[PDB]
Design a protein around this motif. Structure first.
Motif, short mmCIF file in Angstrom:
data_model
loop_
_atom_site.label_atom_id
_atom_site.label_comp_id
_atom_site.label_asym_id
_atom_site.label_seq_id
_atom_site.Cartn_x
_atom_site.Cartn_y
_atom_site.Cartn_z
N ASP A 35 -9.43 4.36 0.05
CA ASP A 35 -8.18 4.40 -0.27
C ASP A 35 -7.51 5.27 0.74
O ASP A 35 -8.04 6.54 1.12
CB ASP A 35 -8.38 5.25 -1.76
N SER A 36 -6.05 5.07 0.95
CA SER A 36 -5.22 5.84 1.81
C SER A 36 -4.85 7.23 1.01
O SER A 36 -4.79 6.77 -0.38
CB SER A 36 -4.01 5.12 2.00
N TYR A 37 -4.65 8.28 1.47
CA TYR A 37 -4.35 9.44 0.84
C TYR A 37 -3.49 10.21 1.69
O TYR A 37 -3.68 10.61 2.94
CB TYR A 37 -5.63 10.54 0.56
N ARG A 38 -2.36 10.59 1.14
CA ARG A 38 -1.26 11.37 2.01
C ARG A 38 -1.73 12.75 2.05
O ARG A 38 -1.30 13.65 1.15
CB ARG A 38 0.12 11.40 1.15
N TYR A 39 -2.44 13.05 2.86
CA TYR A 39 -3.08 14.42 3.01
C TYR A 39 -2.51 15.26 4.04
O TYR A 39 -2.80 15.12 5.23
CB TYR A 39 -4.53 14.23 3.08
N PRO A 40 -1.86 16.33 3.82
CA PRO A 40 -1.11 17.19 4.61
C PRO A 40 -2.24 18.00 5.10
O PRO A 40 -2.46 19.19 4.82
CB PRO A 40 -0.20 17.85 3.74
N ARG A 41 -2.55 17.84 6.47
CA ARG A 41 -3.35 18.54 7.40
C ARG A 41 -2.70 19.99 7.46
O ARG A 41 -1.35 20.05 7.60
CB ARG A 41 -3.76 17.78 8.57
N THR A 42 -3.42 21.04 8.04
CA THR A 42 -2.62 22.19 8.48
C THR A 42 -1.96 22.25 9.73
O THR A 42 -2.56 21.69 10.79
CB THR A 42 -3.85 23.45 8.51
N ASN A 102 0.74 -1.29 0.01
CA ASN A 102 -0.17 -0.03 -0.02
C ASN A 102 0.81 1.17 -0.13
O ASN A 102 2.09 1.37 0.26
CB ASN A 102 -0.98 -0.05 1.28
N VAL A 103 0.08 2.19 -0.26
CA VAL A 103 0.89 3.57 -0.10
C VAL A 103 1.30 4.21 0.99
O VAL A 103 2.05 5.13 1.48
CB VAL A 103 0.02 4.70 -0.90
N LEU A 104 0.57 3.55 2.18
CA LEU A 104 1.24 3.78 3.47
C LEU A 104 2.76 3.16 3.58
O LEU A 104 3.30 3.90 4.70
CB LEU A 104 0.35 3.19 4.51
N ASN A 119 4.86 18.95 5.44
CA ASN A 119 4.55 19.02 4.13
C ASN A 119 5.52 17.81 3.63
O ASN A 119 6.30 17.18 4.30
CB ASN A 119 4.93 20.31 3.43
N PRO A 120 5.19 17.38 2.33
CA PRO A 120 6.18 16.30 1.74
C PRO A 120 7.59 16.88 1.73
O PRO A 120 7.81 17.78 1.28
CB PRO A 120 5.50 15.99 0.46
N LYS A 121 8.43 15.94 1.83
CA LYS A 121 9.89 16.28 1.85
C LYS A 121 10.27 16.26 0.13
O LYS A 121 10.33 15.25 -0.35
CB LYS A 121 10.96 15.24 2.40
N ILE A 122 10.35 17.43 -0.52
CA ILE A 122 10.48 17.82 -1.91
C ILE A 122 11.98 17.88 -2.26
O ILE A 122 12.94 17.97 -1.41
CB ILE A 122 9.71 18.81 -2.23
N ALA A 123 12.26 17.48 -3.75
CA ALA A 123 13.69 17.74 -4.04
C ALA A 123 13.68 17.75 -5.65
O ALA A 123 12.95 16.99 -6.23
CB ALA A 123 14.62 16.41 -3.63
N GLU A 127 6.50 11.14 5.99
CA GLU A 127 6.15 11.70 7.14
C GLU A 127 4.89 12.62 7.11
O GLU A 127 4.94 13.39 8.03
CB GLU A 127 7.30 12.55 7.79
N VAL A 128 3.98 12.68 6.25
CA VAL A 128 2.84 13.29 6.07
C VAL A 128 1.57 12.34 6.34
O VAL A 128 1.53 11.06 6.12
CB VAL A 128 2.87 13.83 4.58
N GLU A 129 0.70 13.14 7.17
CA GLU A 129 -0.55 12.10 7.79
C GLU A 129 -1.44 11.61 6.48
O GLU A 129 -1.66 12.01 5.38
CB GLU A 129 -1.45 13.16 8.43
N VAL A 130 -1.82 10.40 7.11
CA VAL A 130 -2.49 9.30 5.89
C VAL A 130 -4.03 9.58 6.30
O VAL A 130 -4.25 9.51 7.57
CB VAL A 130 -2.23 7.90 5.82
#
Lengths: 846, 134, 144, 138
Positions: free
Chosen positions: A284-291, A214-216, A295-299, A267-270
């Protein structure tokens, strides 16, 4: 006051209300058109044939249902004073662009939810000029065709060639490599692939998605725009081809770079949201960043590869920045936009920080990216190998006290003249308060960096000083940037064509100005309309899809014509028409635009639909339709029939329909938009109330005792705020999809118009309507909550928590669920139920 | 039919194409009731005519219900410069009211697309056009 | 929250829906009995000639096929009633107008009545509201 | 190319302009049952000859009833009635006068009569205000 002077709406049956909605439907089908879009001009270069160009575009002929790639033939000479309506010739031979009954993949239906693409068919295509390549996705499988490059043009439609693959799953987001049109690229299983059309050879480039579980448990994606980027920063691709081909020169090989965004969303809330297949009862799981959550670790990363004249991907290579991205660029939360300079010298990117009051554009030269391997000695080796001089240049740095709106206008010029010192164009709203274009010349002064050791950047570390920042536009109006508008920069005549609101805030007009001096701003469109335009790449002729509050949308083709020595004053002459103006239905009365001034003496605009068969003297029940939130302007001189027919249906039953854009609504500048900063939900309702009292005074048919406030997203949130903070004026409140708790909504929106909950506790407690439930009415049937159950934007939790707090405070409501609809009620049957429920609720309880 | 020369039937080459040819031996013509229309030409001439179909010319145009078919969609094959009037079968509304005579839009097709010429004049049941009839 | 306008209501109903009734009414006089095939396919013009050629080389006949006045909204199944259904055999009733490519044989309704006589009535209506979409009675006059 | 007539109309509101042309009933001489078809066509003989070609392929013959003498409005719903309405089985309750080419078959009302005899009364009536516009004994 007078029951002989208060208009009574006729109580229809439920089947009567359905009969009304169907009679709207019959007329409604003709009214909706799905106007042609995504125009692509190609010249014919013949000088003896009949057609000057071929315009390629998406459209539905209406013979069929799904919109498909089509073309028109633009002639060299029109017969004057006799309008040419273009033939809509088909490229493809009437095949299904979508599978049976609209089944998609779950990620495709999600992407169409983020882009709000309600239409079926070829929604987006990609095009390559010289090869004449049309790469598109039909029926979850890539397709391609070619029309007039090294080959010739056509008059019959062809078969769209399917692209064979060994990959299992959908192949999303295809793009032709501009440097080499034989090569293309796509996303598969959230990893970047690259292929070659004629040989069929495919090749993975990224390895961030193991596909194990899964995406988790499998959290890294690559080349994929995440949730908050897709739904609040309007970026849907996360990879950008390099437009030129470089030669590293082993013996004959050719590199082809791609910049992509790697995202590690571990590390973002599911959150779990119910799936469309209700029988399975799975979510469905969703990596949804709550306020407030992280946030996701970007690069950013370069996936390069090297090929040969035989057409095979011989070598490949992942590259990553010499330091980690978060450390080389502190205070960088989101990559708003990215791409390359057209020569290929630098890969640019717009970064943006978590407060969203600090945006900065940066150029990243490809030598800054070393190869990526787990061997730390190879890593140090190429950290030594990267030159001391090469450097990321933070070219532009917007700082504000309100918030940064992402302006995707960025035109880097070629800089080979004066071989340093990049000159670009850039929309800047934070400087003067209004989104205006500027020509900015920065100076790329590299100081010399040892990239092997790790350093800590300072606050203005890579920030280049500005040589000059000439202002090309100024005023109390803005240049349109967001929502897929763009500029067109003719570098031969040295002109920049933009769209703007210079004539009036209610209309989008195409303007042109020179970027040598701000001489004058020439409008290229007729006033009294609002225009969505699209230029030829040869800058000689454009399309404009335009409309007004009265007239339906038409799509006219104009041709810039005049003496070539004065290109700024070239007169746009109407050449031909593509889709002429549709028939307004006989029951449809176009609505009236008005304006007024507040107690702060700011001008707000508004619409009103008058009650059909209006009787003077009679006072009428008033539906204050509302959105009232940022990045959306309800009131403008544009056709309100294809999207707001329900408002006319209300009018046709006899309801006054009022629509107000109070403070916060866009296209009126940052200071206007910023009246809701850290008090969003609080000031809009005063603007709406004042709009009622003005319309009540101006027109004499507004009954203050019977006011309904209806809204759907932020509008539903405001309708509930209206019923709380202005109970005596608003009789009922049909709150659809409401945002009831701000602390639960995602980062990109909330963190920008308010901020992190630790910062604004009073604003969150006063704005989350579900925490203010005690002030809702004790009377019954004054509150109707509507919600789509499978929602992913305004999650069902919001309505659920509202109903929870209503239960705990002992207050009545009514509620309607749409079990299969995400955020817009998509299916027409469910939409018809929504409308008959709205008419019924108003009929009975208003 | 044939106006001044008496009964001469228009030549049909095949029923399934609905093509109607004639050679005019006379100056001037009279209204054909079988076509319900009339073209006048002042010398001996070949002309070919089609009654094809409106559907494959107007369903290819999108706001087709912002128009209605009010005629036969003539196709003409004659030499240019010599036809001096064509009369198309207008369907009448001027006997009543609420119809403009100025905003009328004649449909001149090309492989380019639909053209909307302004007609010179409208009759009770025809319209007259100018000499470049293509 | 970028304002789903949510007007929706995109049925996009085609003017082909009258000539989807023309595909309707295929009967075959091979035995003493007579039987029918019913098709309703929009969203392709080539389905007319395709199912025409397919079912005349499959030995069926074309009948009058009166057209519905309303171009019918897509996404909703339409039921079948009449004096025919309930006395003589009809294997499926409801028709969902869904697309398939013209090279494929579609879903069809099969209708056996044996001897014909004075005729028998077939009707196509909607289940959403029970309004008349289509209504006719079969001919003993359009046969061999 | 081809040349076409003016058909400009308007976009703002309705007009439902009247049409000039004829309404035609066609006949059968089939031995078991005789079926009439009442058409609602807005055009003239060339479109009628295209319909004639189709009907010829499906064995129809026709007598020419006189045309309507009041103008009849395009696209309006016109209820069709008659002496054989109710006592004989006939006519779907509705009809539009909208034009479509003979390639895409026309709107029509079925009429089983048995013996053709001479002919019986027919009616046509506007659904908006219930006005008779035409009758012919056949």
């Amino acid at each position: 006051d007078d029951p002989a002077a208060r208009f009574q709406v006729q109580k229809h049956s439920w089947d009567g209300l359905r009969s009304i909605i169907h009679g709207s439907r019959k007329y409604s089908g003709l009214i909706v058109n799905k106007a042609p879009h995504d125009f692509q001009f190609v010249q014919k270069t013949d000088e003896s044939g009949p057609h000057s160009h071929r315009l390629y575009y998406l459209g539905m002929p209406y013979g069929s249902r799904e919109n498909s790639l089509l073309y028109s033939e633009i002639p060299k000479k029109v017969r004057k004073e006799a309008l040419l309506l273009l033939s809509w010739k088909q490229m493809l031979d009437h095949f299904q662009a979508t599978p049976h009954h609209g089944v998609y993949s779950r990620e495709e239906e999600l992407l169409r939810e983020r882009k709000r693409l309600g239409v079926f068919g070829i929604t987006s295509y990609d095009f390559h000029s010289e090869s004449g390549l049309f790469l598109f996705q039909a029926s979850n499988s890539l397709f391609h065709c070619r029309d007039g490059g090294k080959n010739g043009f056509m008059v019959s439609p062809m078969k769209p060639l399917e692209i064979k693959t060994q990959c299992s799953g959908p192949r999303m987001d295809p793009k032709i490599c501009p440097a080499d049109p034989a090569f293309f690229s796509f996303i598969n299983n959230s990893d970047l692939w690259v292929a070659n059309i004629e040989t069929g050879e495919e090749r993975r480039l990224t390895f961030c998605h193991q596909g194990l579980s899964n995406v988790l448990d499998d959290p890294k994606s690559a080349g994929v725009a995440t949730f908050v980027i897709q739904e609040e920063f309007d970026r849907f691709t996360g990879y950008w081809w390099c437009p030129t081909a470089s030669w590293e020169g082993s013996e004959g090989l050719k590199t082809l770079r791609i910049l992509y965004e790697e995202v590690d969303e571990s590390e973002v809330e599911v959150i779990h949201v119910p799936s469309p297949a209700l029988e399975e009862r799975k979510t469905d799981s969703y990596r949804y960043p709550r306020t407030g959550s992280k946030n996701p670790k970007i690069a950013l990363k370069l996936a390069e590869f090297q090929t040969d004249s035989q057409g095979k991907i011989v070598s490949t290579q992942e590259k990553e920045l010499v330091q980690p991205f978060s450390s080389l660029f502190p205070k960088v939360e989101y990559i708003a936009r990215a791409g390359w300079t057209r020569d290929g010298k630098y890969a640019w990117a717009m970064f943006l920080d978590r407060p969203q009051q600090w945006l900065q554009l940066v150029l990243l030269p490809p030598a800054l990216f070393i190869p990526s391997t787990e061997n730390e000695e190879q890593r140090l080796a190429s950290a030594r190998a990267v030159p001391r001089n090469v450097q990321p240049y933070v070219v532009y740095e917007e700082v504000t006290n309100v918030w940064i709106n992402v302006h995707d206008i960025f035109y880097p010029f070629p800089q080979s003249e004066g071989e340093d010192e990049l000159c670009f164009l850039r929309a800047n709203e934070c400087k003067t308060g209004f989104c205006h274009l500027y020509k900015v010349t920065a100076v790329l002064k590299s100081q010399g960096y040892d990239w092997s050791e790790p350093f800590s950047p300072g606050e203005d570390e890579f920030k280049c000083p500005i040589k000059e920042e000439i202002a090309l536009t100024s005023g109390e109006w803005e240049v349109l940037a967001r929502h897929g508008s763009k500029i067109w920069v003719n570098e031969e005549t040295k002109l920049v064509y933009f769209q703007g609101t210079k004539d009036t805030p209610l209309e989008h007009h195409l303007y042109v100005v020179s970027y040598e001096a701000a001489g004058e701003i020439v409008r290229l469109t007729t006033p009294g309309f609002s225009h969505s335009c699209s230029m030829s790449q040869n800058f000689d002729m454009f399309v404009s899809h335009y409309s007004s509050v009265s007239t339906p949308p038409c799509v006219h083709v104009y041709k810039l014509s005049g003496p070539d020595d004065d290109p700024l004053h070239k007169q746009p002459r109407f050449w031909a028409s593509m889709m002429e103006a549709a028939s307004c239905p006989p029951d449809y009365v176009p609505p009236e635009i008005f304006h007024f001034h507040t107690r702060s003496d700011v001008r707000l605009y508004g619409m009103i639909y008058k009650p059909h068969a209006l009787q003077p003297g009679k006072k009428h029940p008033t539906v204050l339709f509302v959105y009232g939130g940022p990045q959306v302007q309800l009131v403008n001189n544009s056709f309100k029939g294809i999207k707001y027919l329900r408002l006319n249906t209300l009018a046709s039953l006899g309801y006054a329909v009022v629509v107000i854009d109070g403070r916060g609504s866009c296209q009126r500048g940052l200071r206007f938009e910023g009246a809701l900063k850290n008090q969003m939900g609080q000031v809009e309702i005063e603007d709406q109330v004042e709009g009622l009292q003005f319309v009540a005074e101006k027109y004499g048919f507004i009954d203050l005792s019977r006011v309904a406030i209806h809204g759907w997203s932020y509008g539903g949130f405001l309708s509930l705020m209206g019923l709380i903070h202005k109970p005596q004026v608003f009789k009922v409140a049909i709150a659809g999809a409401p945002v009831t708790v701000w602390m639960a909504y995602d980062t990109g929106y909330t963190e920008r118009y308010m901020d992190v909950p630790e910062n604004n506790q009073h604003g969150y407690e006063a704005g989350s309507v579900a925490l203010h439930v005690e002030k809702l009415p004790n009377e019954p049937n004054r509150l109707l909550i509507l919600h789509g159950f499978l929602d992913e934007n305004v999650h069902f939790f919001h309505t659920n928590f509202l109903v929870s707090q209503l239960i705990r405070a002992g207050k009545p409501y009514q509620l309607q669920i749409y079990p299969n609809e995400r955020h817009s009620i998509r299916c027409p049957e469910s939409g018809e139920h929504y409308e008959v429920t709205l008419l019924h609720f108003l009929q009975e309880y208003l | 039919f044939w106006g001044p020369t008496g009964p001469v039937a228009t030549e049909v080459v095949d029923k399934e194409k609905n093509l109607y040819r004639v050679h005019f031996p006379v100056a001037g013509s009279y209204r054909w009731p079988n076509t319900g229309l009339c073209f006048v030409m002042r010398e001996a001439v070949t002309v070919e005519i089609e009654f094809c179909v409106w559907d494959q010319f107007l369903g290819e145009i999108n706001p087709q219900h912002s128009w209605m078919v009010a005629g036969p969609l003539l196709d003409i094959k004659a030499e240019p410069g010599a036809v001096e009037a064509v009369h198309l079968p207008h369907f009448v509304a001027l006997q009543g009211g609420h119809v403009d005579t100025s905003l009328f839009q004649m449909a001149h097709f090309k492989e380019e697309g639909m053209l909307l010429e302004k007609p010179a004049r409208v009759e009770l049941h025809h319209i007259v056009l100018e000499n470049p009839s293509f | 929250s970028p304002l789903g306008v949510l007007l929706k209501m995109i049925h996009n109903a085609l003017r082909f829906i009258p000539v989807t009734s023309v595909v309707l009414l295929y009967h075959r006089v091979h035995p003493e009995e007579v039987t029918f095939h019913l098709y309703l396919i929009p969203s392709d013009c080539s389905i007319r000639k395709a199912i025409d050629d397919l079912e005349m080389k499959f030995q069926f006949v074309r009948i009058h096929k009166p057209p519905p006045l309303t171009p019918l909204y897509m996404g909703c199944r339409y039921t079948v009633s009449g004096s025919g259904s309930g006395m003589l055999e009809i294997l499926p009733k409801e028709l969902e107008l869904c697309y398939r490519s013209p090279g494929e044989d579609q879903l069809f309704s099969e209708f056996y009545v044996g001897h014909l006589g004075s005729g028998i009535r077939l009707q196509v209506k909607d289940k959403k509201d029970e309004t008349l979409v289509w209504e006719a009675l079969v001919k003993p006059g359009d046969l061999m």
